[PDB]
Write an enzyme that holds these catalytic residues in place. Structure first.
Site, PDB file in Angstrom:
ATOM      1  N   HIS A  79       0.847  -1.209   0.000  1.00  0.00           N
ATOM      2  CA  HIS A  79       0.000   0.000   0.000  1.00  0.00           C
ATOM      3  C   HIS A  79       0.885   1.263   0.000  1.00  0.00           C
ATOM      4  O   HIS A  79       0.903   2.041   0.949  1.00  0.00           O
ATOM      5  CB  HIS A  79      -1.006  -0.041   1.156  1.00  0.00           C
ATOM      6  CG  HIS A  79      -2.062  -1.086   0.993  1.00  0.00           C
ATOM      7  ND1 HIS A  79      -2.255  -2.068   1.946  1.00  0.00           N
ATOM      8  CD2 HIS A  79      -2.963  -1.267  -0.003  1.00  0.00           C
ATOM      9  CE1 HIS A  79      -3.266  -2.799   1.507  1.00  0.00           C
ATOM     10  NE2 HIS A  79      -3.714  -2.364   0.336  1.00  0.00           N
ATOM     11  N   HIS A  83       1.091   1.615  -5.790  1.00  0.00           N
ATOM     12  CA  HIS A  83      -0.303   1.132  -5.738  1.00  0.00           C
ATOM     13  C   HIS A  83      -1.285   2.287  -6.071  1.00  0.00           C
ATOM     14  O   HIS A  83      -2.215   2.094  -6.843  1.00  0.00           O
ATOM     15  CB  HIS A  83      -0.615   0.517  -4.365  1.00  0.00           C
ATOM     16  CG  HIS A  83      -2.059   0.120  -4.185  1.00  0.00           C
ATOM     17  ND1 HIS A  83      -2.647  -0.885  -4.961  1.00  0.00           N
ATOM     18  CD2 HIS A  83      -2.976   0.577  -3.303  1.00  0.00           C
ATOM     19  CE1 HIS A  83      -3.896  -0.996  -4.526  1.00  0.00           C
ATOM     20  NE2 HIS A  83      -4.146  -0.135  -3.532  1.00  0.00           N
ATOM     21  N   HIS A 117      -6.602   7.166  -2.166  1.00  0.00           N
ATOM     22  CA  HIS A 117      -7.393   6.126  -1.477  1.00  0.00           C
ATOM     23  C   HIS A 117      -6.652   5.321  -0.376  1.00  0.00           C
ATOM     24  O   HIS A 117      -7.341   4.818   0.517  1.00  0.00           O
ATOM     25  CB  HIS A 117      -8.110   5.194  -2.470  1.00  0.00           C
ATOM     26  CG  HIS A 117      -7.296   4.017  -2.887  1.00  0.00           C
ATOM     27  ND1 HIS A 117      -6.359   4.112  -3.898  1.00  0.00           N
ATOM     28  CD2 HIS A 117      -7.293   2.760  -2.397  1.00  0.00           C
ATOM     29  CE1 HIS A 117      -5.826   2.903  -3.999  1.00  0.00           C
ATOM     30  NE2 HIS A 117      -6.370   2.060  -3.128  1.00  0.00           N
ATOM     31  N   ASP A 118      -5.314   5.195  -0.422  1.00  0.00           N
ATOM     32  CA  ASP A 118      -4.565   4.496   0.645  1.00  0.00           C
ATOM     33  C   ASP A 118      -3.542   5.435   1.358  1.00  0.00           C
ATOM     34  O   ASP A 118      -2.591   4.965   1.998  1.00  0.00           O
ATOM     35  CB  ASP A 118      -3.866   3.236   0.122  1.00  0.00           C
ATOM     36  CG  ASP A 118      -4.768   2.012   0.011  1.00  0.00           C
ATOM     37  OD1 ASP A 118      -5.582   1.776   0.933  1.00  0.00           O
ATOM     38  OD2 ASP A 118      -4.662   1.296  -0.988  1.00  0.00           O
ATOM     39  N   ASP A 228      -9.066  -0.899  -7.266  1.00  0.00           N
ATOM     40  CA  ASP A 228      -8.243  -1.313  -6.144  1.00  0.00           C
ATOM     41  C   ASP A 228      -7.634  -2.720  -6.327  1.00  0.00           C
ATOM     42  O   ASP A 228      -6.505  -2.974  -5.897  1.00  0.00           O
ATOM     43  CB  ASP A 228      -9.059  -1.251  -4.858  1.00  0.00           C
ATOM     44  CG  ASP A 228      -8.213  -1.079  -3.615  1.00  0.00           C
ATOM     45  OD1 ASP A 228      -7.026  -0.699  -3.749  1.00  0.00           O
ATOM     46  OD2 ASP A 228      -8.738  -1.304  -2.514  1.00  0.00           O
ATOM     47  N   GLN A 280      -5.370 -17.676  -3.466  1.00  0.00           N
ATOM     48  CA  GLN A 280      -5.606 -16.873  -4.674  1.00  0.00           C
ATOM     49  C   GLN A 280      -6.823 -17.399  -5.426  1.00  0.00           C
ATOM     50  O   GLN A 280      -7.682 -16.613  -5.837  1.00  0.00           O
ATOM     51  CB  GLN A 280      -4.348 -16.831  -5.557  1.00  0.00           C
ATOM     52  CG  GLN A 280      -3.232 -15.958  -4.963  1.00  0.00           C
ATOM     53  CD  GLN A 280      -3.633 -14.498  -4.937  1.00  0.00           C
ATOM     54  OE1 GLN A 280      -3.785 -13.851  -5.977  1.00  0.00           O
ATOM     55  NE2 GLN A 280      -3.834 -13.962  -3.752  1.00  0.00           N
TER      56      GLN A 280
HETATM   57  C1  LIG Z   1      -1.987  -6.137   1.438  1.00  0.00           C
HETATM   58  C2  LIG Z   1      -3.401  -6.154   1.012  1.00  0.00           C
HETATM   59  N1  LIG Z   1      -4.404  -5.841   1.791  1.00  0.00           N
HETATM   60  C3  LIG Z   1      -5.612  -5.948   1.159  1.00  0.00           C
HETATM   61  C4  LIG Z   1      -6.835  -5.620   1.931  1.00  0.00           C
HETATM   62  C5  LIG Z   1      -5.516  -6.358  -0.150  1.00  0.00           C
HETATM   63  C6  LIG Z   1      -6.604  -6.569  -1.127  1.00  0.00           C
HETATM   64  N2  LIG Z   1      -6.193  -6.825  -2.490  1.00  0.00           N
HETATM   65  C7  LIG Z   1      -5.824  -8.171  -2.708  1.00  0.00           C
HETATM   66  N3  LIG Z   1      -5.866  -9.078  -1.716  1.00  0.00           N
HETATM   67  C8  LIG Z   1      -5.488 -10.337  -1.974  1.00  0.00           C
HETATM   68  C9  LIG Z   1      -5.517 -11.338  -0.893  1.00  0.00           C
HETATM   69  C10 LIG Z   1      -5.831 -12.775  -1.197  1.00  0.00           C
HETATM   70  C11 LIG Z   1      -4.449 -12.392  -0.781  1.00  0.00           C
HETATM   71  N4  LIG Z   1      -5.082 -10.738  -3.183  1.00  0.00           N
HETATM   72  C12 LIG Z   1      -5.058  -9.831  -4.146  1.00  0.00           C
HETATM   73 CL1  LIG Z   1      -4.524 -10.459  -5.658  1.00  0.00          CL
HETATM   74  C13 LIG Z   1      -5.410  -8.516  -3.980  1.00  0.00           C
HETATM   75  C14 LIG Z   1      -5.350  -7.570  -5.139  1.00  0.00           C
HETATM   76  S1  LIG Z   1      -3.864  -6.611  -0.573  1.00  0.00           S
HETATM   77 MG   LIG Z   2      -7.194   0.625   1.342  1.00  0.00          MG
HETATM   78 ZN   LIG Z   3      -5.904   0.115  -2.172  1.00  0.00          ZN
END
Ligand SMILES: Cc1nc(C)c(CNc2nc(C3CC3)nc(Cl)c2C)s1
Ligand SMILES: [Mg+2]
Ligand SMILES: [Zn+2]
EC number: 3.1.4.17
Length: 323
Positions: A79, A83, A117-118, A228, A280
């Site tokens: 983040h 990003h 946003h972050d 996002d 995933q």
């Molecule tokens: C550090 C993060 N915090 C949040 C809340 C995230 C949300 N985005 C994702 N989250 C995951 C999770 C399953 C492993 N996979 C993908 Cl591919 C994305 C894009 S990433």
């Molecule tokens: Mg966020």
């Molecule tokens: Zn984000």
């Protein structure tokens, strides 16, 4: 208080010219900003100029704003500044492919909301902050980080020579801040599931009306989630590399929980890396695929995002099968 860019930083941005080679490239959904770090602030200016014109904001104010937003992103594995620009680029591509569906104020608001946003993310989830009673969790009960991101955006606008929205009318200024607030809040993944389910209902029944503000806010909300999560919509080698950053951030949070004698969920446990391909698969099937499926249904030109997401899902299935 907020970190402010130096005079040299915004002046350097002002003189930037995007290479012609990237003009056709930046228009595509799968575009990866990754190899052009020095150009990221300039890419954001270029996208603003193509989305809402060259006199959309005062150039000086815009360059100050961008460079200060950059400095208020932390050096966390995921983040971070990279990003923010990646999410802003996906928004730019959605808006370009559906231009007149949105107002000038919405395009202005959404590109700025995506870049912010972050803002000031500490690399910790809302669950972690709430569980360990962090001061930020005391301030904001729900969507803790998201309300902080919005508060930080407002604070940057309040800096001297940074208010890019000052020339809007009082009603327009209030309206853009509300567009930005709702957009940033919608990036709280906990709100996504309910949002997507309501939109699927409205679409199937045929009651979805873009003239209805509540319906409009929900569509914007889904565009925010889609931007996002756009790392799942890039070419397989890019998606794979970003997944390493995503888990490096999750594992760092897990490490912090282990240091306090608490076992983290498998996604945040580095000793559970073999579970990543199955994690995933679950995420694509339960989160990403429905997101882009609903988005394509509402905004048919966004179909390449769904197609690319399905391609990465197949790549994850191949990893699980041994290929
Ligand atoms: C550090 C993060 N915090 C949040 C809340 C995230 C949300 N985005 C994702 N989250 C995951 C999770 C399953 C492993 N996979 C993908 Cl591919 C994305 C894009 S990433
Ligand atoms: Mg966020
Ligand atoms: Zn984000």
């Amino acid at each position: 208080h907020m970190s402010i860019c130096t005079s040299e930083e915004w002046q350097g941005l002002m003189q930037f010219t995007l290479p012609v080679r990237l003009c056709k490239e930046i228009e595509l959904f799968h575009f990866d900003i990754g190899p052009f770090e020095n150009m990221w602030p300039g890419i954001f200016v270029y996208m603003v100029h193509r989305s809402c014109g060259t006199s959309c904001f005062e150039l000086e104010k815009l360059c100050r704003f961008i460079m200060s937003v950059k400095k208020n992103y932390r050096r966390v594995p995921y983040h971070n500044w990279k990003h923010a620009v990646t999410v802003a680029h996906c928004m730019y591509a959605i808006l370009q492919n559906n231009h007149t569906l949105f107002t000038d104020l919405e395009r202005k608001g959404l590109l700025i909301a995506c870049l912010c946003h972050d803002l000031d993310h500490r690399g910790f989830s809302n669950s972690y902050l709430q569980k360990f009673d962090h001061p930020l969790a005391a301030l904001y009960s729900t969507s803790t980080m998201e309300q902080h991101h919005f508060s930080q955006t407002v604070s940057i606008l309040q800096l001297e020579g940074h208010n890019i929205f000052s020339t809007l009318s009082s009603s327009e200024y209030e309206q853009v801040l509300e567009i930005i607030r709702k957009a940033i809040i919608a990036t709280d993944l906990a709100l996504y599931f309910g949002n997507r389910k309501q939109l699927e209902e409205m679409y199937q029944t045929g009651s979805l009306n873009l003239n209805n503000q509540s319906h409009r806010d929900r569509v914007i909300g889904l565009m925010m989630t889609a931007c996002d999560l756009c790392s799942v919509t890039k070419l397989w080698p890019v998606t794979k590399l970003t997944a390493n950053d995503i888990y490096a951030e999750f594992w760092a949070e897990g490490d912090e929980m282990k240091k306090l004698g608490i076992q983290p969920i498998p996604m945040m446990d580095r000793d559970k890396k073999d579970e990543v391909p199955q994690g995933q698969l679950g995420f694509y099937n339960a989160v990403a695929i429905p997101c882009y499926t609903t988005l394509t249904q509402i905004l048919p030109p966004t179909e390449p995002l769904l197609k690319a997401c399905r391609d990465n899902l197949s790549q994850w299935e191949k990893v699980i099968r041994g290929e």
